[PDB]
Write an enzyme that holds these catalytic residues in place. Structure first.
Site, PDB file in Angstrom:
ATOM      1  N   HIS A  56       2.111   2.377 -34.877  1.00  0.00           N
ATOM      2  CA  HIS A  56       2.738   3.629 -35.279  1.00  0.00           C
ATOM      3  C   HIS A  56       2.003   4.853 -34.747  1.00  0.00           C
ATOM      4  O   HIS A  56       0.815   4.792 -34.425  1.00  0.00           O
ATOM      5  CB  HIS A  56       2.855   3.723 -36.805  1.00  0.00           C
ATOM      6  CG  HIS A  56       1.594   4.153 -37.489  1.00  0.00           C
ATOM      7  ND1 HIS A  56       1.587   5.055 -38.529  1.00  0.00           N
ATOM      8  CD2 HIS A  56       0.302   3.797 -37.291  1.00  0.00           C
ATOM      9  CE1 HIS A  56       0.344   5.244 -38.939  1.00  0.00           C
ATOM     10  NE2 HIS A  56      -0.454   4.492 -38.204  1.00  0.00           N
ATOM     11  N   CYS A 112      -3.542   9.189 -37.342  1.00  0.00           N
ATOM     12  CA  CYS A 112      -4.037   8.012 -38.045  1.00  0.00           C
ATOM     13  C   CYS A 112      -5.281   7.456 -37.359  1.00  0.00           C
ATOM     14  O   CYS A 112      -5.429   7.568 -36.141  1.00  0.00           O
ATOM     15  CB  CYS A 112      -2.951   6.937 -38.125  1.00  0.00           C
ATOM     16  SG  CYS A 112      -3.481   5.377 -38.877  1.00  0.00           S
ATOM     17  N   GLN A 130       3.171   2.227 -47.483  1.00  0.00           N
ATOM     18  CA  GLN A 130       4.033   3.132 -48.221  1.00  0.00           C
ATOM     19  C   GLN A 130       5.487   2.690 -48.110  1.00  0.00           C
ATOM     20  O   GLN A 130       5.923   2.261 -47.041  1.00  0.00           O
ATOM     21  CB  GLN A 130       3.855   4.567 -47.716  1.00  0.00           C
ATOM     22  CG  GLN A 130       2.406   5.039 -47.729  1.00  0.00           C
ATOM     23  CD  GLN A 130       2.258   6.483 -48.153  1.00  0.00           C
ATOM     24  OE1 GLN A 130       1.151   6.949 -48.430  1.00  0.00           O
ATOM     25  NE2 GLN A 130       3.369   7.208 -48.189  1.00  0.00           N
ATOM     26  N   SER A 153       1.990  10.433 -46.128  1.00  0.00           N
ATOM     27  CA  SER A 153       0.903  10.672 -45.190  1.00  0.00           C
ATOM     28  C   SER A 153       1.293  11.688 -44.118  1.00  0.00           C
ATOM     29  O   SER A 153       0.461  12.461 -43.642  1.00  0.00           O
ATOM     30  CB  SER A 153       0.440   9.360 -44.547  1.00  0.00           C
ATOM     31  OG  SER A 153      -0.445   8.660 -45.402  1.00  0.00           O
ATOM     32  N   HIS A 156       6.104   9.447 -39.087  1.00  0.00           N
ATOM     33  CA  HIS A 156       5.728   8.336 -38.224  1.00  0.00           C
ATOM     34  C   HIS A 156       6.846   7.993 -37.253  1.00  0.00           C
ATOM     35  O   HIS A 156       8.011   8.306 -37.493  1.00  0.00           O
ATOM     36  CB  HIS A 156       5.436   7.068 -39.032  1.00  0.00           C
ATOM     37  CG  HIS A 156       4.654   7.306 -40.286  1.00  0.00           C
ATOM     38  ND1 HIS A 156       3.297   7.085 -40.370  1.00  0.00           N
ATOM     39  CD2 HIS A 156       5.043   7.721 -41.516  1.00  0.00           C
ATOM     40  CE1 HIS A 156       2.880   7.370 -41.591  1.00  0.00           C
ATOM     41  NE2 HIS A 156       3.920   7.759 -42.307  1.00  0.00           N
TER      42      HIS A 156
END
Length: 162
Positions: A56, A112, A130, A153, A156
Site C-alpha cells: 500500500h 507508512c 483497519q 491513518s 491508501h
C-alpha cells in the site's frame, strides 16, 4: 467450506500461515483434516481467502490520527489535497519502470513505515488491519490495484500480490 465438522480454517497471525481448528477438542493443526472435500476448500480459499498479502501507499492528512511521518513531523494538508496527490501519484504506475513501480512510488511518497519495504505489509488476516482497509484488501484479486481508500491513518491505494 469443504471442511467436515466442527472444523474451521483460520489464519495464524504469529505464523503468517493458514491452519485448521477443532473447537470441540481445542485442537489446531497445519495439515488438512481427514474427511475434507479437498478442492472445495481450495476454491473456497481462492475466492474467500482467510489471508492476503498487500502493498500500500499511505498519504496522511491533517485529520489523520497520526499526522507525523518520516517526511514531516507535522502534516498540514487537507483530505482532498492528499487524495488528488495520491491520484496523480497512481497515474504514474508502471510495473516496468524503475521509478514508477508500485514499490517505488511507495518508497518515494508513502507516509507508512512500510515505505522502506516497497509498501509491503506482508501477509495478514481479518483481525489486524483497519476495517476500511481490510474491506478493500479482501475484495481485491491477486495483482489488482484498489481505488482510493480512506481510513483513520490517512488515505491508501492498495495492491494485492498474494
Amino acid at each position: 467450506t469443504g471442511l467436515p465438522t466442527p472444523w474451521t480454517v483460520r489464519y495464524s497471525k504469529s505464523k503468517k500461515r493458514e491452519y485448521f481448528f477443532n473447537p470441540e477438542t481445542k485442537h489446531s493443526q497445519w495439515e488438512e483434516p481427514e474427511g475434507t472435500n479437498k478442492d472445495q476448500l481450495h476454491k473456497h480459499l481462492r475466492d474467500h481467502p482467510v489471508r492476503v498479502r498487500c502493498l500500500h501507499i499511505l498519504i496522511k492528512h491533517k485529520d489523520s490520527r497520526r499526522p507525523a511521518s518520516h517526511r514531516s513531523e507535522n502534516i498540514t494538508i487537507s483530505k482532498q489535497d492528499a487524495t488528488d496527490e495520491l491520484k496523480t501519484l497512481i497515474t504514474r504506475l508502471d510495473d516496468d519502470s524503475k521509478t514508477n513501480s508500485f514499490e517505488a512510488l511507495a518508497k518515494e511518497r508513502s507516509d507508512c513505515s512500510s515505505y522502506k519495504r516497497g509498501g509491503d505489509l506482508g501477509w495478514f488476516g481479518r483481525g489486524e488491519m483497519q476495517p476500511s482497509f481490510e474491506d478493500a484488501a479482501f475484495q481485491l484479486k491477486v495483482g489488482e490495484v484498489s481505488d482510493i481508500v480512506e481510513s483513520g491513518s490517512g488515505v491508501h491505494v492498495i495492491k494485492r500480490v498474494g
